[PDB]
Amino acid sequence: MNLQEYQSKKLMSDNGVKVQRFFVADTANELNAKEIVLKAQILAGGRGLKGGVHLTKDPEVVGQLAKQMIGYNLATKQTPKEGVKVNKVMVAEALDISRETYLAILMDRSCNGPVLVGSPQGGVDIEEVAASNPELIFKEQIDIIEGIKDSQAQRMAENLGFLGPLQNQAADQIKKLYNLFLKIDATQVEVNPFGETPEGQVVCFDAKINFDDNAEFRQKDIFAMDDKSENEPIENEAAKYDLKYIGLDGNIACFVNGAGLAMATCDIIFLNGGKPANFLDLGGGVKESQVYQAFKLLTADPKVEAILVNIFGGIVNCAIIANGITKACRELELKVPLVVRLEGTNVHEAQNILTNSGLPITSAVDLEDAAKKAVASVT
Amino acid sequence: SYTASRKHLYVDKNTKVICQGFTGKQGTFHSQQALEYGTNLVGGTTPGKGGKTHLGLPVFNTVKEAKEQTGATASVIYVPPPFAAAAINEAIDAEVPLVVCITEGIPQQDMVRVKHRLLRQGKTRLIGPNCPGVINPGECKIGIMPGHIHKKGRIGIVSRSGTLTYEAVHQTTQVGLGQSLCVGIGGDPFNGTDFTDCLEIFLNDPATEGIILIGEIGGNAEENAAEFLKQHNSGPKSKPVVSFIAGLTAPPMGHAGAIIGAKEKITALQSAGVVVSMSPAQLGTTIYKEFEKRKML
Numbered sequence A: 001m002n003l004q005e006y007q008s009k010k011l012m013s014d015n016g017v018k019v020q021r022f023f024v025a026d027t028a029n030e031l032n033a034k035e036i037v038l039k040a041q042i043l044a045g046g047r048g049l050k051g052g053v054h055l056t057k058d059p060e061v062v063g064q065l066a067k068q069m070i071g072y073n074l075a076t077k078q079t080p081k082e083g084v085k086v087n088k089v090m091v092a093e094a095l096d097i098s099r100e101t102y103l104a105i106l107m108d109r110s111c112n113g114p115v116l117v118g119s120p121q122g123g124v125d126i127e128e129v130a131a132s133n134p135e136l137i138f139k140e141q142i143d144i145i146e147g148i149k150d151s152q153a154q155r156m157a158e159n160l161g162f163l164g165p166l167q168n169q170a171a172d173q174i175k176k177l178y179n180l181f182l183k184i185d186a187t188q189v190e191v192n193p194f195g196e197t198p199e200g201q202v203v204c205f206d207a208k209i210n211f212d213d214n215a216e217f218r219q220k221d222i223f224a225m226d227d228k229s230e231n232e233p234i235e236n237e238a239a240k241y242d243l244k245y246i247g248l249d250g251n252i253a254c255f256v257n258g259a260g261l262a263m264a265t266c267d268i269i270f271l272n273g274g275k276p277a278n279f280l281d282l283g284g285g286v287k288e289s290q291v292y293q294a295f296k297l298l299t300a301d302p303k304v305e306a307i308l309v310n311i312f313g314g315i316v317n318c319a320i321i322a323n324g325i326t327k328a329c330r331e332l333e334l335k336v337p338l339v340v341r342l343e344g345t346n347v348h349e350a351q352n353i354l355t356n357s358g359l360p361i362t363s364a365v366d367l368e369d370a371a372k373k374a375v376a377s378v379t
Numbered sequence B: 001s002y003t004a005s006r007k008h009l010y011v012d013k014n015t016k017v018i019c020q021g022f023t024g025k026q027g028t029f030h031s032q033q034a035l036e037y038g039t040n041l042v043g044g045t046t047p048g049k050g051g052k053t054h055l056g057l058p059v060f061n062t063v064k065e066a067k068e069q070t071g072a073t074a075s076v077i078y079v080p081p082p083f084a085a086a087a088i089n090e091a092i093d094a095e096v097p098l099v100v101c102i103t104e105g106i107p108q109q110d111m112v113r114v115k116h117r118l119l120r121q122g123k124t125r126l127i128g129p130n131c132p133g134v135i136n137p138g139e140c141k142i143g144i145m146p147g148h149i150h151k152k153g154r155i156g157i158v159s160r161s162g163t164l165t166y167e168a169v170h171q172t173t174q175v176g177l178g179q180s181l182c183v184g185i186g187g188d189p190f191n192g193t194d195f196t197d198c199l200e201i202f203l204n205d206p207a208t209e210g211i212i213l214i215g216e217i218g219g220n221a222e223e224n225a226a227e228f229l230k231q232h233n234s235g236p237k238s239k240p241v242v243s244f245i246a247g248l249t250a251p252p253m254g255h256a257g258a259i260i261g262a263k264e265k266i267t268a269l270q271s272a273g274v275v276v277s278m279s280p281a282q283l284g285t286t287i288y289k290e291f292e293k294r295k296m297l
């Protein structure tokens, strides 16, 4: 899970991390700032009308630029080619930057846990120097048990280019970032640029935090901040019943158990000329109320012209799954065809339960068969 | 030295299994499927109910208690995420040779701490978390896989996906090749077993004549598997390898990831001699014809 900048900045401030003074608005009209910074608020990097971030000296100008941002899409290097519709903007007390540095704390598989990653040549496009000069990238692997040591924070701050009284100041901010990184169950805490003001203040000007979904049960307050506005209404409503929805551009909805299997389902539909509209992973747990709801959401989208049910290895006996579809389909009178592939315990009985119901249900034997039946029913 | 525990991946009929989270709904269901399949399930554990009987088997409060009484050599974990990492730690303490954690949703930080200790020892081998488990077709089933689609055979299967693994299993049986050992390493970033671990066993297992690797987009696991094969599977007694990568048609914040694949995963696997099947329904046929191209039938 990822939050907006203004949500991360507040979280960082509460844990002793130095950040700018910011305000958020939804309109261009909506500090005593000697200089103001205007930044588009989207869950994506590379925001830099052209440009997602601007610097001016007094308000007036912000009201003129905020009209060209709010309501418009902002296409960056890491956004979809269409871009991301900008809804909020940040107006903060802009500070001068003497030096731009890159710093990040993340759980990396290769590093077997947390690792500090920084470069003295930070700011804007850090990814250039990473590929260009691999020597400008520095790594300090942190021991999850011992924690971040003072020596490691000093060495990173030394390699980041913080000299004199700034070295011990930066090292203290690095320590607070790592402790925050662990406290909030984060997968990535990225500050770019990890700046240096002319007054001698080490500041985190921008912040990008990725949160571990698996830790939500102990991060209630943090996950309550998720706006969920940048997701399709179909996704948010699917999650209410513990169903992970992902939309595509097609006409064949997919209802599968297992992300890997669902991707293979979409992959094999393409192979036979079809285009999958969506794909709704049912996960391990299979509550016969979900299958009831599952069809309700998949059918809501008008582009759906057929639903493909591919369930292989469900925890529940496929017979119970067969009865949930029949009544769920009967209660709502499904219009589009329905190709059903079930596999698991007691399936020979489960299949006849489908076709011997007088309902528009076509059974499939395997995956390749289910795909060809789906592309054929959309003629 | 944690590699010394790789051998414990190869379960068999002599493996004595215990279930952590025994009386739990999931623990009861899969514990019953295990018994019906013939798995040597000798009991399980749930705090506060030790001594009583469940599914005709003894229940214990701790893992070391069940191990000393039943001499168990493998453990399967269905404990909820908030306490699953600690359930793994409990088994490593008891020095259970093989621990299979099925639970999904364990915080990454928890597993980072578990894996920190796991790598400093070589007595316990962990599979998972968030994996279907391991199964020796016809001898031992430690996981959630449907047992009826398996059949002892000649193809060693390793999969980073869950249910998708069953397609490779079902197909290898229908073509008459079957499976020698199927392992699901799970889909979490910090886990106790990776691709190379299972490949090491397959290449040195005589019963494993062919190999199927199930992958998908994201990460570097498939690439590391390729480099491993290009070194140890290219030369004299090269075993045929087949693979499928899910997400070919899947659609694509920060600069960290770019600093520290789909198309590239495929190109890398092919460089090591791996035959990549573009369709998820042709894993059995591809490996079959590869056996035909090598007179291995």
Ligand SMILES: Nc1nc2c(ncn2[C@@H]2O[C@H](COP(=O)(O)OP(=O)(O)O)[C@@H](O)[C@H]2O)c(=O)[nH]1
Pocket (backbone or CB within 6 Å): A037, A039, A044, A045, A046, A047, A048, A052, A053, A055, A093, A094, A095, A096, A097, A100, A123, A124, A192, A193, A205, A206
């Ligand atoms: N001087 C100054 N530059 C800033 C400030 N905020 C952002 N920038 C500049 O904005 C550019 C891109 O940084 P940023 O907006 O944080 O990241 P983005 O997500 O790539 O747009 C860099 O050239 C920074 O120097 C600020 O408060 N003061």
Ligand SMILES: [Mg+2]
Pocket (backbone or CB within 6 Å): A124, A191, A192, A193, A206
């Ligand atoms: Mg930045």
